[PDB]
Symmetry: D2
Subunit: 25 residues, 4 copies
């Protein structure tokens, strides 16, 4: 049950970060 | 700036949804 | 069993495409 | 060109792994 959560979170973070930067820079 | 933020918007949407789903299902 | 496959595939495709372009353009 | 292709490389790697995992597990 976790591993998946962990992963999904990772991916989610990469994506959010990517967005943020895509705005800023 | 724009095409980018669309791509990243999508990315974060799919990823966050995957996370949500993986946490509750 | 499928839905997940489907999703993962989608994401995979977005990523591959993103790569390809990141090379080409 | 480069930082980008690193980001996209990562993205495709994590995503493809998620797909693989979801198909066999």
């Amino acid at each position: 049950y976790y591993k998946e959560i962990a992963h999904a979170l990772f991916s989610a973070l990469f994506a959010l970060s990517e967005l943020y930067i895509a705005v800023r820079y």
